[PDB]
Amino acid sequence: YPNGLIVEELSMGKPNGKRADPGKTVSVRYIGKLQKNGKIFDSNIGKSPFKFRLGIGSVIKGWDVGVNGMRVGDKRKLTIPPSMGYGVKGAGGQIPPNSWLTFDVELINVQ
Ligand SMILES: C=CC[C@@H]1/C=C(\C)C[C@H](C)C[C@H](OC)[C@H]2O[C@@](O)(C(=O)C(=O)N3CCCC[C@H]3C(=O)O[C@H](/C(C)=C/[C@@H]3CC[C@@H](O)[C@H](OC)C3)[C@H](C)[C@@H](O)CC1=O)[C@H](C)C[C@@H]2OC
Ligand SMILES: [Cl-]
Ligand SMILES: [Cl-]
Ligand SMILES: [Cl-]
Ligand SMILES: [Cl-]
Ligand SMILES: [Cl-]
Ligand SMILES: [Cl-]
Ligand SMILES: [Cl-]
Ligand SMILES: [Cl-]
Ligand SMILES: [Cl-]
Ligand SMILES: [Cl-]
Ligand SMILES: [Cl-]
Ligand SMILES: [Cl-]
Ligand SMILES: [Cl-]
Ligand SMILES: [Cl-]
Numbered sequence: 001y002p003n004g005l006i007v008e009e010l011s012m013g014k015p016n017g018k019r020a021d022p023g024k025t026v027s028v029r030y031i032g033k034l035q036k037n038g039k040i041f042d043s044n045i046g047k048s049p050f051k052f053r054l055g056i057g058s059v060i061k062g063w064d065v066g067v068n069g070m071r072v073g074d075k076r077k078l079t080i081p082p083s084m085g086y087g088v089k090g091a092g093g094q095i096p097p098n099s100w101l102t103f104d105v106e107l108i109n110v111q
Pocket of ligand 11: 083084086
């Protein structure tokens with residue numbers, strides 16, 4: 001297992017697409033999964049866009065680090081250690097304690 005977060009480029013969007021920088025409100029399409037078994041716990045595909053302010057710590061740390069630097073249309077895979085996810089708490093009744101997480105993410109907009 002990695003010492004920290006792994007971020008993989010799955011595909012590149014627009015070369016001059018707006019860039020996700022700290023302080024921006026960014027809009028992301030995602031699928032979240034438990035890394036240990038691949039079970040999917042959430043997606044917003046076909047639902048409303050998920051917006052968050054990058055860098056303020058409202059999302060798990062793996063997202064604040066992992067989404068940073070994306071340009072619109074980029075797709076990334078995030079592999080997130082427990083300390084950069086929900087740690088001993090878990091979440092949603094869906095993520096057990098001490099879970100490694102995987103997310104597929106696509107940047108849709110930057111505001
Ligand atoms: C305070 C206002 C309530 C507000 C609640 C809602 C809008 C309800 C709505 C269903 C929330 C999420 O859906 C958008 C839902 O998302 C999941 O399904 C999911 O896929 C996930 O993991 N996501 C969502 C996408 C961004 C990454 C991550 C996250 O970081 O989510 C964030 C998260 C839970 C962070 C905690 C916050 C507390 C810290 O202590 C902890 O610190 C480690 C990290 C979300 C976006 C928060 O910022 C927003 C809120 O909490 C969880 C499996 C379960 C979670 O429902 C609970
Ligand atoms: Cl890569
Ligand atoms: Cl590409
Ligand atoms: Cl694109
Ligand atoms: Cl753009
Ligand atoms: Cl969609
Ligand atoms: Cl910020
Ligand atoms: Cl802040
Ligand atoms: Cl750049
Ligand atoms: Cl960890
Ligand atoms: Cl932890
Ligand atoms: Cl929570
Ligand atoms: Cl499980
Ligand atoms: Cl795990
Ligand atoms: Cl997928």
